[PDB]
């Protein structure tokens, strides 16, 4: 049956060593609700809900894309992301985006774009590399002579150069903070709109490295605990910067891998911390990169079939513990769905279903054959094709 379900899988439960500390307790409670889910098949189990609410998440996404309740008042200043998650999530699920919204989206983002490069949380807000990423990384999903033109590649570059700091790392926004998160946005963007000068990220690779701590993973800023989100940022930025090898790849792999839960099946952003869907991409997003890393470096051993993580046990979690009855996906069972997770919780499924190291390919689609999503680029988390198109565009300039 499904790995997660198997009998002897209840060996991978928590042994707290008859000791108890908040971490223990919490991990304990999760293992309960997570178990209850798996065990929840004793009465009927013919064609399990091992289905992916294609249409159900669609309403949530289709609708949420045009209007959001007063609840979303907290995302008031990150509106372009609210576009990015949805547009992406759709592509993953595979719903053509209406060529009429296409404009509106563009027409919207064009309104956030500050006259001084980059984009803003919304109409009339100061430019900031997060939304700016969102916006650009979004415009590219649309990939039309219309989207591509929205971006003022000239100014974007100037903005970037402003956040640019001496030690290499950029600020987030003017007078804002600094952490890998920053560099990744710069890189991700500049590369797409092909606006990189040989003197932009001077030192940046060097900095993103000072981030990799004693745990082999990477942290927000030098000295900070290893964290999956930042890690993805750091590595990805370097896959762009073509510096992967600058880190201790072996000390890194060891970690990521330990990030998967020997029980649940998903990942934990940090050692000794509850599991969490979105990280299904943040963490497991890493291996498809670490693959390109080693292989490039010239390593044999690397498989030719999967990624270095239990792809099944991951899907077996995203599916049995992260989908909402009503729609959209989430953190862990019993947690208010939101377009963020609904995004990265799926991106984290595409990863686990698809493999493409070399000209060869081999998927592993758990659940019903109607659960295969579209591929997702390992570094940008967008159509592996909308990416090729995007670049193969701005380059002609």
């Amino acid at each position: 049956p499904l790995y997660s379900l198997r009998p002897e899988h209840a060996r991978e439960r928590l042994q707290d060593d008859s000791v108890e500390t908040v971490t223990s307790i919490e991990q304990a409670k999760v293992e309960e609700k997570i178990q209850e889910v798996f065990s929840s098949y004793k009465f009927n189990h013919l064609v399990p809900r091992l289905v992916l609410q294609r249409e159900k998440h669609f309403h949530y996404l289709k609708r949420g894309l045009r209007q959001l309740t007063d609840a979303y008042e907290c995302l008031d200043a990150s509106r372009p992301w609210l576009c990015y998650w949805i547009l992406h999530s759709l592509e993953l699920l595979d719903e053509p985006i209406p060529q009429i919204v296409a404009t509106d989206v563009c027409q919207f983002l064009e309104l956030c774009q500050s006259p001084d490069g980059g984009f803003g949380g919304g109409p009339g807000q100061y430019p900031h590399l997060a939304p700016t990423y969102a916006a650009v990384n979004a415009l590219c999903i649309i990939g039309t002579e219309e989207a591509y033109n929205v971006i003022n590649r000239e100014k974007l570059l100037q903005y970037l150069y402003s956040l640019k700091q001496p030690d290499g790392s950029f600020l987030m926004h003017v007078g804002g903070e600094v952490d890998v998160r920053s560099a990744y946005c710069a890189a991700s963007v500049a590369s797409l709109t092909n606006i990189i000068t040989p003197d932009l990220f001077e030192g940046t690779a060097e900095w993103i490295a000072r981030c990799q701590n004693w745990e082999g993973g990477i942290g927000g800023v030098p000295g900070m605990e290893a964290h999956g989100g930042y890690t993805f940022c750091g590595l990805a930025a370097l896959v762009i910067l073509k510096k992967e090898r600058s880190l201790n790849l072996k000390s890194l792999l060891q970690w990521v891998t330990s990030r998967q839960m020997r029980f649940e099946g998903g990942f934990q952003g940090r050692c000794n911390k509850l599991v969490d869907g979105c990280y299904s991409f943040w963490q497991a997003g890493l291996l498809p990169l670490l693959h390109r890393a080693l292989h490039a470096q010239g390593d044999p051993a690397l498989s030719m079939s999967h990624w270095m993580f239990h792809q099944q046990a991951l899907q077996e979690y995203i599916l049995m513990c992260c989908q909402c009855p009503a729609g959209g996906l989430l953190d862990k069972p019993g947690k208010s769905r939101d377009f963020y997770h609904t995004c990265y919780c799926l991106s984290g499924l595409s990863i686990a279903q698809h493999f493409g190291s070399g000209a060869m390919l081999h998927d592993v689609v758990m659940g019903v054959p109607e659960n295969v999503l579209q591929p997702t680029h390992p570094v940008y988390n967008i159509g592996p094709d909308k990416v090729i198109q995007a670049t193969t565009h701005f380059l002609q300039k």
Binding site: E12, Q15, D17, V19, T21, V22, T23, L65, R66, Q67, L68, T69, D70, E73, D76, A77, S78, R79, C83, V101, D104, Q107, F108, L111, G120, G121, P123, G124, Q125, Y126, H128, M172, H173, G175, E177, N213, W214, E215, G219, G223, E225, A226, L253, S258, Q260, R262, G265, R270, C271, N272, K273, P300, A301, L302, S303, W307, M308, F309, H310, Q311
Partner: protein
């Protein structure tokens, strides 16, 4: 003088001190996307914020206006920006400010702008006295708030405040030895103060680490830290480590060990050792238990340590 929660709170249009100005409706274009139906109170505030911001009005009233724009969305970096400004110009009392930000942060600790806004103030006053204690209280609600720890690392570096941190680390360690964040804190206070090259220091830690290992065999932190402070020099450099870890197979087994060994045997296979054939299997063997028994979920990985080790150790 009011608050946004006080019953006697009134919108701004319905106010006198605010009748000599016209609101600025957020233009979302003819055909809006991902639009929010802002509540009356919320939508109102900002219509007024804009009007100010747009008029770069460095007024005392705009200031108060911000506090509210912040309560509605303390995640709005723009509003935070225009705030520091008002602080600059109106030349406001910064402690009067510190008190305000301690509050907010206490309220929404998982925020970015609210923290960075505390750092700004602090570097302005050049006085971190309050910090170490504050952060601590935050850490006493969430012994793992990233921001809290990060803010702390900065406050400790920028102001050379080490002296009494290693105690702190040890303290919270009792509280919850499994706290991976605290473990990272330790290796911050040491690598930056005494370092681990010191024979006594590296000695001291490793010993202790092992302690926490025996006390709680499955604490995946104690182990990552043991492998953590001994991995640079390589493990083959500390022979005894391979025997002690062997006196744990019984009432202390854990896949966290199975691996350390393998790890050890790896570094050994990288340093011309005797029995460059007895270990090479003694370990490839241990990779089995992992992938098929003790740590199967990581089967795919192990089934690579195996391959890798063979791929470079034969004939």
């Amino acid at each position: 003088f009011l608050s946004l929660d006080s019953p006697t709170y009134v919108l701004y249009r319905d106010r006198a001190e605010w009748a000599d100005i016209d609101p600025v409706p957020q233009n979302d274009g003819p055909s809006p996307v991902v639009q929010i139906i802002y509540s009356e109170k919320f939508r109102d505030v900002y219509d007024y914020f804009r009007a100010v911001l747009q008029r770069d009005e460095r007024s005392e009233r705009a200031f108060k206006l911000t506090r509210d724009a912040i309560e509605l969305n303390a995640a709005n970096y723009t509003v935070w920006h225009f705030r520091r400004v008002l602080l600059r110009s109106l030349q406001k009392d910064l402690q009067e400010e510190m008190n305000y930000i301690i509050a907010i942060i206490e309220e929404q600790p998982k925020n970015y702008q609210v923290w960075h806004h505390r750092r700004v103030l602090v570097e302005w006053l050049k006085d971190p006295s309050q910090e170490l204690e504050f952060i601590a209280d935050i850490l006493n609600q969430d012994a793992k708030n990233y921001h809290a720890w990060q803010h702390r690392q900065w406050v400790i570096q920028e102001f050379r405040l080490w002296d009494n941190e290693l105690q702190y680390v040890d303290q919270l360690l009792k509280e919850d030895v499994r706290n991976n964040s605290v473990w990272n804190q330790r290796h911050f206070v040491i690598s930056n103060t005494t370092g681990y090259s010191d024979r006594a220091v590296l000695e001291r830690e490793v010993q202790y680490t092992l302690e926490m290992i025996k006390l709680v065999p499955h604490n995946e932190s104690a182990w990552n830290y043991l492998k953590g402070i001994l991995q640079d020099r390589g493990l083959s450099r500390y022979p005894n480590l391979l025997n002690q870890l062997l006196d744990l197979q019984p009432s202390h087994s854990s896949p966290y060990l199975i691996a350390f060994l393998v790890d050890i045997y790896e570094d050994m296979l990288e340093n011309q050792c005797d029995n460059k054939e007895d270990i090479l299997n003694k370990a490839l063997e241990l990779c089995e238990i992992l992938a098929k028994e003790k740590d199967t979920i990581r089967k795919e990985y192990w089934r690579y340590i195996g391959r890798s080790l063979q791929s470079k150790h034969s004939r």
